[PDB]
Structure formats: C-alpha cells, structure tokens
Write a protein that binds this ligand. Sequence first.
Ligand code: HEM
Ligand code: HEM
Ligand code: HEM
Ligand SMILES: COc1c(O)c(C)c(C/C=C(/C)CC/C=C(\C)CC/C=C(\C)CC/C=C(\C)CC/C=C(\C)CCC=C(C)C)c(O)c1OC
Lengths: 110, 431, 110, 76, 57, 126, 126, 62
Amino acid sequence: VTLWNVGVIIFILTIATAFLGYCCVYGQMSHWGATVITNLFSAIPFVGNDIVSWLWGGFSVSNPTIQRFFALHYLVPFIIAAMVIMHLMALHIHGSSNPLGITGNLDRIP
Amino acid sequence: AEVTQLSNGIVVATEHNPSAHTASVGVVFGSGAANENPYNNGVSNLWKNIFLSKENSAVAAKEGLALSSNISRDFQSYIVSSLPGSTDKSLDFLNQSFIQQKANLLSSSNFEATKKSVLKQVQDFEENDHPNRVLEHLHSTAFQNTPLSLPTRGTLESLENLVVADLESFANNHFLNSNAVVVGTGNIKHEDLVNSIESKNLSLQTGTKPVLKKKAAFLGSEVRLRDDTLPKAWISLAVEGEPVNSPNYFVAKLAAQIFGSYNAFEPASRLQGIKLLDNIQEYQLCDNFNHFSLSYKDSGLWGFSTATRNVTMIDDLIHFTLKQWNRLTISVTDTEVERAKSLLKLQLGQLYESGNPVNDANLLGAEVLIKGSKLSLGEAFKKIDAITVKDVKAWAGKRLWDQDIAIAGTGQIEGLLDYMRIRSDMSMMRW
Amino acid sequence: MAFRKSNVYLSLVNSYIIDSPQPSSINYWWNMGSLLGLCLVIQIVTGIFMAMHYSSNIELAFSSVEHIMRDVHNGYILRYLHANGASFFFMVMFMHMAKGLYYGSYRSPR
Amino acid sequence: AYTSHLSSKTGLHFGRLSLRSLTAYAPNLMLWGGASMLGLFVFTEGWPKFQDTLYKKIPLLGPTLEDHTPPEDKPN
Amino acid sequence: SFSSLYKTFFKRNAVFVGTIFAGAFVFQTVFDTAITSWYENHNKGKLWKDVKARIAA
Amino acid sequence: PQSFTSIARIGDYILKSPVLSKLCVPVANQFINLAGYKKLGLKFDDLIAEENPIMQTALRRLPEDESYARAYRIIRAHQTELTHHLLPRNEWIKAQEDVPYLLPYILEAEAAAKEKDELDNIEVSK
Amino acid sequence: PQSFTSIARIGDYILKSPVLSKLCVPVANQFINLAGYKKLGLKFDDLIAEENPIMQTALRRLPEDESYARAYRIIRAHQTELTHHLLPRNEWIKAQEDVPYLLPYILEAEAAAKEKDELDNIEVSK
Amino acid sequence: KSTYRTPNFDDVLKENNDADKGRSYAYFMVGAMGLLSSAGAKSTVETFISSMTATADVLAMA
Ligand code: HEM
Ligand code: HEM
Ligand code: HEM
Ligand SMILES: COc1c(O)c(C)c(C/C=C(/C)CC/C=C(\C)CC/C=C(\C)CC/C=C(\C)CC/C=C(\C)CCC=C(C)C)c(O)c1OC
C-alpha cells in the first residue's frame, strides 16, 4: 500500500512539471492556459484572491510570472528524482508481484 | 480473631485456629537491617545463625521443637514450633536459650564456626543469585546514604571485622521489652499463652532503642554491574512507592496487579488479559517479569523486574512496558480495574490464609509492631472493592507521571540505554 | 519493535540521527559537519528565491542584481545572506578539513 | 449465593479503536485544537487581510499594528 | 503552590505548547513597538518627519 | 478482504434454498470454467492471497503431503505461464479434484481471531 | 604502518651503543613526559591503533586478567577527557608501570605473517 | 571496596529536592527557548514569502 501511495505523489509532481515548462514557451496557448489555471484558486472563499496575487507576482500573467515559472521548472525534476528512490525503497521490501497473483517465493531468477 | 493484650511492656498477640495440627510461639522485634550502620552491617545475620546453631538446635530437637528465624528491613523474628500441648516447653526453651542466657551460645569456637559459615553464604549469593542481587542494589542506589539502603544479609567486607563484642552491643540496644511482640499462632489460645508468660518472669531488657537521625529519602539514580560472561540480563526499575500506614496502600497494590507476572514457558501464562503481552510476544523480548509494590516504615518502591536473553532488543522491552504505565493516568479502563480486583483478593487470601503457622507469626507480629493492631481480611476486601477508576488515575498522576526513577542491572546490559532516554518514557508528548 | 525501527523510511532517520552510537569523548570540533549541512541548505534556499528575479543575459545580468537589492521586498537580505553565507561555507570547511588532519581521521579504516 | 457463570457484554469498537478510548481522549483532543489555532495566529500576523478582521480588534495589542503615515509621504 | 503551577501548565503537553504559542504572539507585537521607539528616539532630529515639520514653520 | 466466514454464510443460504440453487449454481459453474485456472493445473484454493497472518497460520497447520503437492502445482503454473502456453488437455484439473482443501483450516483460524477480539473488548455487567 | 619489527631493530641498535644510548634516551624520557598520556591513566601500549588484522590477534591472545585491566584504563580516560580535566596526581601512571605488556604478542604475530608471505613466493632451485 | 558503597556526589547535589519545584524550573527554560525559536521561525518564513508578492516597480504602475 505504501508503494502505491508514493507513486500517486510522483504523478502529481509530474503534472506540475509539465505545466510549468509549457508556460516557458509563452505562445498563445501558453499564455492563455495559465490565466485559466491560476484563476481557479480565486474561488477559495477567504484569502482566495490574495493567493493568486502572490502566485502571479503582480496583477496578471506578466514578466514576474514567467521568470519564476522557469525557476520552478528547473527544481521539481530533482524532487522527482528523490521520490523515485523512495519508490524503489518501498518496492524492495516484499519485491514485485507476478501476473498469476500468487506468491513468487518458490521460483526466482536474478 | 486477632486478640492483642499488653503486659508490663511486652505485647501478646494470637491468631487461634482449632483445625491446626501445630502451634507456634516466638518473639518479633521491631528493629531490622535498617537499624545498622555501614560498619556493623551483618550483625542481625550473625544473630540469626547463632540461634539456629548446631548445639542450640540439638537441644531443641530432643524435646521435639523446630526453630526458625527471619531478617527484614524493619523486623526480625525468632520462632519455635511444636505440637499442640507442648507449648509450655517452647516458651521455656526461648526463655533460657535466647532471652536470659546468651553466654553459652556466644562462646568461642561457636562464634568462630558460625562466622565461617555465614561468610560462605554471602560469597555465593554475590556471584550465583543474580535476580535477587539486582533487587538489593536497587535499594542501595535508590536510598543511598540513608538507613533504607543496607543489605539485609550484610556485606562481605563488613563481616570480616565483626567480633563477639559487637553482637552484645546490638542485643543490649534492641532486644528490649518496648521493641518486642510475643506471638502465638496455630492451635493455641490467647488465655493460655498470657497465663504461661506471667507464670514465669519472662522479661527482656529495660532500656529504649536509639532513634535514627535522618529518615529515608528517594533519589533518582542508577548502578550498572555489567558482566559480559553471564548469559542473560537482569534489570530492576522502580519509582518511589507508598509506606505501610498510607491511604493509597491498596491502590498502589492494585496498580501492580494490572500488569502482573509472566512466564514465557507456561502455556497458560501467555493467555492472560494483559495488554502488554501482545507487544512483547511477536518478538520474544523477555523470559519473565513481575510487578511489585514494596512498603516500609518510611517509604516504598513500585516497579518491575525482568530477565531476558534477547540482548539486542532490551530498549524495545523497556519502551513498551513504560508506555503501558502511562495509560494508568489517562486511559485505564473499567474492565482492567475489575479484573485486578479479583486477582488481588485471591493473592491476599493465599498469603494470610496459608497453612503455615510460621508464616502467620511473621505476618501478624510485624503488623502489630507498626500500627499496634492487625487489620482483618474481611475489612481489606471491603477496601479493595471500593476502588474506582478515578482513584487509579489520581494516584498514577501523582506517583508515576513524569517522575524520577531508579535502575539496577547486571549481565549483558550494553543494550540498556542511558538514564535520560529511559526517563523520557515516563510521559507522552501526544497528551 | 518500535515503529521508528520497523518503518522503511523512519529506520533511515533512526539509524542516522536518533540511535546512532557516538563516542562520549568527542569535543566541539566534531560539530563542524552538522554546520556544513546547514550552510548547504541556506545557499540552496536563498539561491532559488533569488533566481525568480534574475536574468542571465550579459546586457541584463548586472542590472538584475541591482533590481533585487532595490525593488524586491527583503531582497537585500537574500543577497547579503547568499554572498556572506558562501564566505562562511569555506570558513567551516577549512576548519572541518584541519580537524581530520590533526586527529588522523584519514587513516586506514576511513 | 453460588455463582456458576460470568455475565458480560462486548463494547462498541472498530479495530484498534473503541468508544471508551475515544471518550477518554476527547477532552484532550479539543485542547490540541485550541493549540493549533494559537499557532496559526502567530504565523499569519503579517498577513494584512487577517489583521483587518481579527488582530486589529484586540484591545491593547490591536492599535499597535495600525500604520500612521501621512498620505504626503507615500509615493503610491 | 508549585504543585498547582505544574498541574495547570506543565502536566499536559497540549497546554504547554499552547502557552508557548500564545506567549510568542504577545512577544511579537510588543518587541517590535519597543524597538522602533528606542531607535527613533536615539536619532531625534535626523528623520524625515522631524525635518519636514521644521520647514513647515 | 471479505472474511471467508462472511462468504460461507451467504453461500450456504443459496445452497439450502431449492429455488435459488437451481438459478445460481448453474451460473457459478460457467463462471469457473471461463476463469480458466484449471487449464494451468491449479485449484482455486491455490489462488488465495497469503500475505496476512490468517493465511500464514492456516498454511502452517496443513499436513506435509498436501503442502508438498501444493508447492508443485504452483511451480508448474509459473513455468507454464512463462512460455505463454497452456497445459496439455489431459493434465488439466478436473472438477471433482477442485475441492476446498484449505478452507477448514482458514475458518478455524478465523474463529479464533474473532473470539480474541471480543474478549479484549469485554465489559462485565452487574 | 611502520612495523614493530623495524621499530625494535632501530631501537635495539641504539640501546646497545654506549655513545648513542647516552644522548637519545635522556631526550626520549622528556619526550614521553611532555606527551602527557600518563596523566590520563594510560600506558603507551593502550594508544596503538587496533583496526588492523595483526593487532586483532594480539588482543585475542592477551591473558584474560591483563585484558580486563586495559578495558578499565580506556573507559577511565574517555570519562576524564569528557570533563576536560586531568586525573589526580596520585592516580597518574608511573615510569615503572609503563611497561610494554602487549609488545611480545605483536612481534610474534608479525613474524608469523612475514613467514607466510615468504612461503607464497617460494622458488624451488630447479 | 564494596559495590554497595556509593561514591560521593555531594558536590553536585541540590540541598532541596522538590519534584514540582525542580521540574517547573527546568520547563520554564525549555519553554523560553521554544518561545523565541517560534518567533524567529515566523520571521524567516515571512521574509521568503514576502519576496514573491509584487516588486516596487510593479506597484508603481498599478
Ligand atoms: C520530468 C522532467 C521534465 C518534464 C516533464 C518537462 C516538460 C517540459 C515541457 C512539456 C515543455 C514544453 C515544451 C514545448 O511544449 O515545446 C518544456 C520546456 C522546457 N523545459 Fe522541460 N521538462 C522537464 C525537465 C526539464 C529540466 C530539468 C530543464 C532544465 C534544467 C528543462 C528545461 C526546459 C526548457 C529550457 C524549456 C523551454 C521551452 C522549450 O525548449 O521547448 N526541462 N519542458
Ligand atoms: C558539504 C560538505 C561536507 C559535509 C556536509 C560533511 C559532513 C560531515 C559530517 C556530518 C561528519 C560527521 C560529524 C563530524 O565529524 O563533525 C563528517 C565527518 C568527516 N568528514 Fe565531512 N563533510 C563535508 C566535507 C568534507 C571534506 C571537504 C572533508 C575532507 C577533505 C571531509 C572529511 C571528513 C572526515 C575525515 C570525517 C570523519 C572525521 C572523524 O569522525 O574523525 N568532509 N563530515
Ligand atoms: C553550495 C551552494 C552555492 C554556493 C556556494 C553559491 C555561491 C555563490 C556566490 C559566491 C555567488 C556570488 C554572490 C556575490 O558575490 O554577490 C553566487 C551568486 C548567485 N547564486 Fe549561488 N551559490 C550556491 C547555490 C545557488 C543555487 C542553488 C542557486 C539557484 C538555484 C544560486 C543562485 C545564484 C544567483 C542567482 C546568484 C546571482 C548573484 C547574486 O544574487 O548575488 N546559487 N552564488
Ligand atoms: C545533527 O545531525 C545531522 C542532521 O540533522 C543533518 C540534517 C545533517 C546534514 C546532512 C545532510 C545529508 C544534508 C541534508 C540536505 C541536503 C542533501 C540538501 C538540502 C536540500 C534542499 C534544501 C532543497 C529544498 C528546496 C526547496 C524546498 C525549494 C524552496 C522553494 C519553494 C518552496 C518554492 C515556493 C513554492 C511555490 C508553489 C511558489 C547532518 O550532517 C547531521 O549530522 C550528522
């Protein structure tokens, strides 16, 4: 169960990494896709509007936003590499499974 | 049932039992090992073996009498057992062999032979009896520099210096009428025993016993007698407990019953209703443990003793047992209190209601030298039944929660951690 | 056993900073290793937050550092922390290496 | 009278958790709730949205957070 | 009493932790105000507020 | 993670009902044939997941002759699947051989663990 | 890393020359006094690094009573250094007690190791 | 010397040994360290978060 849960964390971090790199091109889809995702957090009842201002660095998607999105797109991949090791550590406890769904302790190969 | 009279200074107490086939009489003194000093330690052990000497006990066998003697922290007793109807000879033997004439027993070649034998009794105790020599060092470290820290058997280094003149000093100071209780248990009537004593002189000395300057005080400490050649580890751990004359005397006793005793090699001991057992059984952490509650005149001790062969997981054993002590303050349940009530009443009814009049004489004489009377077994059952869960939590929060501890150990105890790591387990940060 | 010893991730924490058996005679010179760990954390965190306002073009590199000092809120604190922190990094490392040279920590087993 | 059997019931539970253990822990779990609100106020003190609705209405510690700079001294 | 002091603040960790947080909230506001007051008073006559009112005479 | 005590309780009610037995049992027989574990030389009781204390107790109390046979059927199934083939038709497990051999050991271990949980949460009346 | 066989070879030559024994020894006694290990309750043989295979056999073959005493002197020095103090002057190791108790067990283990190496590189004069 | 003779510890022991008094003294000093550490942590977190809000030149063009 713990190996499954670490994988869900890796999946979340990979979605964020791909989104951040797509904004670094600053095409028409890059700019307008960021103002419909970051504007989602404005729906929080209290201090929802203060969060988007802190995330934007200003009043809309502008120069502060693009420069900070590249710094984060550089960093998250190294966090992903750290959670892969934790992924392999939890697999090494009981080993992998097999397509038959039963124990594999009676026949093993290196 | 217990009847207590007074006569010119000595106290006579009896516990009559017609169904008994053996009567027992003797004298119990209200002074013990806690009334000596680090230089005469072992005097009361010599007086015990002089009473049971070969020449003294040969005289008693001809009349058909058997002798016994016990040495404790607060009291020492000298008992003579015989068939019913032979009680007159037992009183006569005690009078002319221990009470009024100690010169023949204290002769040379009889003191020099007894001293030779006792010096051997403590040499092998100090190197063969491990569980009982760490419980003695627990007293030594928890009451250091106070009277409640000297071993009852004495010290090897201290016993090589004792002479016959030291035994006469102790007898003159403690074997007195104001420090003595005359007891009779088994098949013997109260009227008959007191009549026999007055028909003779039967008077001890006249003076009063010296008073001790400082009282006993607990100190959190530890002593480590590490020995890597022994195959096991023996550990004792305790906090400050209750004195004999306390309102929380039965509440502390019931608290030790909740955790109880354990034997890993007994199939029925592994099925007890103790929540600690399911933590220490997946990996065999210990071979046995027992929870005690010892009471004295000044203070007491509350804790447990363990012996294990799993020397690499001692920390796990200590961590789990102390975490269950924490629940006595926060989350002890009603089922645990009801079970411990039933097991405490059975255990008390097996100690006071045994079939040995010698055991009864020690128990009855010691309880009169402290509070002047004996509490019956029927009244104690009414006090145990009245205990509630709120009583346990109040007592545990005062004596157990975040308190100092005393530790003693021997054997392979490298895996026993430092004092501060263990003391951190007396409370929880989650509460 | 305790949860700190049975868990896959906690057992690495327990074996390194909780239950690690240390000699009782080590003095304060054995404290520089833990300080170097704090220096590395300080440099990484201040560098990342400064990199959200920095431009690496040769025509804008100098002016972007001046922009951090003047326009970014608490930006001079980050810059002076990063510049002086790097000087303290080498101070501790020089003493860390001289400790092992004095006490023969380079010898056979290690 | 002679007793020949034990009368008992089973308490409500689900796994390691029981109703009796929940009741004992309930009063202490509210204090941990109040210790987390106090710790939340410490870290949001500089947030001006929380100042204007919560912290500035404290009798003695409130007014010391208000800024008293004249408009002629501000560029924005 | 010292027993009542321990029983109220030091027996439960929840109260101990909550007291630390509530003492840090009070310290935070008081420490700032007392520092600016001393700092401003040590530099009287050199601040913009001081010189602005002087030329306003 | 449904207990075998729960499965047996529901299953028996179907078998003792004459109406339900004639409509449900025929469906179950076709369900088992389509599952196709017999074509790999396995019984159903070999497919139960064993990484829990209940099934580790039951496998400990199984007699040696049964335990040796089970280990051969499991090894043979791993090698047959390795090759992406089936066993020859004459080596398939028959319906009369697919018997619940491990079920009585599982139920006995499950009843002991339930009684232990009901005694740890005991409440004494009066 | 310099073997005790080589150390003794140079030392024994010095101690048998009348001229050389007259100037080297007086400066060697002052060197030992300034070293200051005797003020912690230690002999020189307790300072030898023990993480090599040669010194592991020497400590194995040391008589039991001498091995118990060495463990006390090592534990005592760690506790004294922990307090940043010195031992009282009456507990210092004296000159007549600073003897090479472990030296014979090292020279014998080293001689055996040297003979093994010479026998793995043997060349028969064919 | 016997092992029941404890050494001298009187140069480090405190004359009055009260559990309630000596525990409240120790917890007041670990609670003071945790009070100042808690206030210094709020300062450190706020400094980094605040450097992301809006620079002075951006606010000028509001
Ligand atoms: C898991 C790892 C990564 C993923 C999934 C990822 C994903 C992406 C994606 C989807 C784009 C958009 C490209 C496009 O649409 O044309 C992009 C662009 C970019 N990425 Fe990454 N990235 C990763 C790692 C990195 C790293 C580590 C760096 C730099 C150190 C980096 C640097 C860049 C750059 C410079 C661009 C510029 C736009 C372009 O060249 O197309 N990426 N990334
Ligand atoms: C970021 C750089 C470094 C970090 C984080 C680091 C960390 C550590 C730590 C935590 C310790 C144990 C604690 C201590 O001994 O103080 C240690 C020990 C040691 N380090 Fe480093 N170190 C670093 C760089 C170096 C360098 C540059 C050298 C040598 C050139 C070195 C050599 C050693 C040695 C020999 C030891 C063991 C010394 C002993 O225990 O006696 N380290 N290191
Ligand atoms: C061990 C880690 C690091 C060390 C020793 C280090 C060292 C330095 C030094 C000495 C400077 C010159 C600053 C000056 O003289 O004013 C500098 C500048 C700089 N560093 Fe780092 N650095 C480290 C990590 C990082 C990281 C991880 C980043 C970004 C993710 C970063 C970003 C920057 C930036 C943007 C500058 C621009 C100049 C300035 O802001 O002062 N640094 N670094
Ligand atoms: C006392 O015991 C210790 C000890 O406790 C430690 C830690 C060490 C140190 C040991 C180490 C291995 C060092 C550990 C550190 C590292 C390997 C590197 C540290 C890595 C980082 C600091 C990276 C973390 C970076 C971030 C979280 C980025 C910050 C940016 C953010 C949050 C962006 C804001 C987010 C949004 C969405 C806008 C010791 O040496 C030691 O002595 C034995």
